[PDB]
Write a protein that binds this DNA or RNA. Structure first.
Length: 87
DNA sequence: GCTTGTGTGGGCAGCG
DNA sequence: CGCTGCCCACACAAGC
């Protein structure tokens, strides 16, 4: 989406100049989808699993269908969201 | 190989 | 007024 990722402060709106791609939540991996919520530890929880997220938040390994079988690693959740808190 | 399934991609309304 | 929550079709890979 061209609004913002499900991360905290990542308003890295789709910019082809920057090396990032977009994707949707692991709808086919609910439990795993759920830990993504654990990464969205902020009150300002962005859109749900229906919205789209960008590459930078996960490891290339877990990027998408290019993972193991056809989706990300069930044991991988976007931790690259941020260091802690922006200013 | 072609067709179907899952990933991919962006928007509008209600409340501080 | 801006942000959060949920939906549909197409391309590539797998199956027949």
């Amino acid at each position: 989406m061209v609004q913002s990722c499900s991360a905290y402060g990542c308003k890295n709106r789709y910019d082809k100049d920057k090396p990032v791609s977009f994707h949707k939540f692991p709808l086919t991996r609910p439990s795993l989808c759920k830990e993504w919520e654990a990464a969205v530890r902020r009150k300002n929880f962005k859109p749900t699993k229906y919205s789209s997220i960008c590459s930078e938040h996960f490891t290339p390994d877990s990027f998408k269908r290019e993972s193991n079988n056809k989706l990300l690693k069930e044991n991988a959740v976007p931790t690259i969201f941020l260091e802690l808190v922006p200013r």
